[PDB]
Every structure is written in structure tokens, then in C-alpha cells.
Amino acid sequence: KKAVWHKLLSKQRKRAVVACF
Amino acid sequence: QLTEEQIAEFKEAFSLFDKDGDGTITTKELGTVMRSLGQNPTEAELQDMINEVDADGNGTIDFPEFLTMMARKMKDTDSEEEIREAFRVFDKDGNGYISVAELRHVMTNLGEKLTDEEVDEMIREADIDGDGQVNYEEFVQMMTAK
Ligand SMILES: [Ca+2]
Ligand SMILES: [Ca+2]
Ligand SMILES: [Ca+2]
Ligand SMILES: [Ca+2]
């Protein structure tokens, strides 16, 4: 489902932001 | 210092952590995000992370403080570099294609429950050329829409 692709991109983006803290 | 496009992108990121829209990120909110990614932080880790970013020592992160972080650490990201970076992370063997087994690993790594049928469906829906894997152009087409 496209929603799960998009959710994975967002999770990867959130992981990168968490790693900035 | 920061352009308008990037301050808007960073505010959107901030909003994903500030779930109650009160204008601050708490250790609870940071912990919620981390656990949604399959991570298992202790309360002590969460406190340390909030302390590193929290300029006025009030124990929460406001958007100005978050912006200072993003400007020190991510002052060169767009929607495009982030898709490129995600592809590089997902393509574990570096052959320029995401396989079924690589996508399963990514899902586990990001705390996303999976089935074989879901992974198969995901690869088939993204695989425009029908070669059975997802190349960068395919990835970008699937990832461009939020
Ligand atoms: Ca909040
Ligand atoms: Ca603060
Ligand atoms: Ca690969
Ligand atoms: Ca393909």
C-alpha cells in the first residue's frame, strides 16, 4: 500500500531527526 | 541563517513530535516518537537528549530551540536529499535496487510490523519496470507524495 511506503519514509526522516538530539 | 523553505520543513518535523500542538516537545513526546520507530529508550536517555537541545533549561524543547538544533545538524536537507538518503539506507547491498528481503529488514529496523504478502505487494506496486526490485526512479515516484 502506498501509505506504508510513505510511513516508512517518514519513519526514516524521524529517525534522522531523533539522531540530531 | 535558515531560508523560509527549510524553516517550514523543520516546523512540519517539529509538529510530528509536538502531538498536543502546545509548542513544546517533552520527554514523553520524544519517547513516543522513538518507540514508534521500534527503539526502546530509557527515561534517562530521553532526559539526556532533551537536555542537549534545551537552551533555557526549562526541560522542554520549544520550536526556536529545535530550529537551532536543525540548523547545527541538518542545515542542508530538502524533500529531495531525504528521499536520496532514505534510498541509500534501504538499499542494504548498494546495488541500486531495493529487494523484498531488504524492505523486510528496513521494516523491522523501523518498528513496522510486516507480512510476506504486504512486502510482496509493496515491491510489486512500486516496481514500474517489472524487474522485481525497486530502483531509485521508482522509489522517488512512490515517495514524492506525503
Ligand atoms: Ca507538546
Ligand atoms: Ca526549553
Ligand atoms: Ca539492494
Ligand atoms: Ca524495478
Residue numbers in the entry:
A (entry chain BBB): 1 to 21
B (entry chain AAA): 4 to 149
Sentences from the paper on this structure:
The CaM A102V variant was identified in CALM3 in a female who experienced episodes of exertion-induced syncope since 10 years of age, had normal QT interval, and displayed ventricular ectopy during stress testing, consistent with CPVT. CaM-A102V was shown to lower CaM Ca2+-binding affinity and promoted spontaneous Ca2+ wave and spark activity in permeabilised cardiomyocytes. However, in the presence of Ca2+, the affinity for RyR23583-3603 was significantly reduced by up to sevenfold when compared to CaM-WT from 51±9 nM (CaM-WT) to 146±40 nM (CaM-N53I) and 349±72 nM (CaM-A102V). Interestingly, O Ile53 then forms a direct hydrogen bond with N Asp56. We observed that the Ca2+/CaM-A102V–RyR23583-3603 complex is structurally very similar to Ca2+/CaM-WT–RyR23583-3603. Even though no major structural differences could be discerned at the vicinity of the mutation, the A102 V substitution increases interaction surface hydrophobicity compared with Ca2+/CaM-WT–RyR23583-3603 structure. For the Ca2+/CaM-A102V–RyR23583-3603 complex, the H-bond network is more similar to Ca2+/CaM-WT–RyR23583-3603, with just a single extra interaction (Met144-His3588) and a single lost interaction (Asn111-Arg3597). In the Ca2+/CaM-A102V–RyR23583-3603 complex, Lys148 forms an extra salt-bridge interaction with His3588 in RyR2, and the interaction of residue Glu11 with Arg3595 in RyR2 is absent. However, we showed for the first time that Ca2+/CaM-A102V significantly increased the substrate phosphorylation levels by ∼60%. (C) CaM-A102V: a large reduction in affinity for RyR2 reduces the inhibition of RyR2 by Ca2+/CaM, and is combined with an increase in CaMKIIδ phosphorylation activity, which promote the opening of the RyR2 channel.
CaM is a highly conserved Ca2+-sensing protein encoded by three independent genes CALM1, CALM2 and CALM3, and all three encode an identical 16.7 kDa 148 amino-acid-long protein. The dumbbell-like structure of CaM comprises of four EF-hand motifs, each able to bind one Ca2+ ion. Moreover, Ca2+ binding induces a large conformational transition in CaM that exposes hydrophobic patches within the helices of the EF-hands, which permit interaction with a wide range of targets.
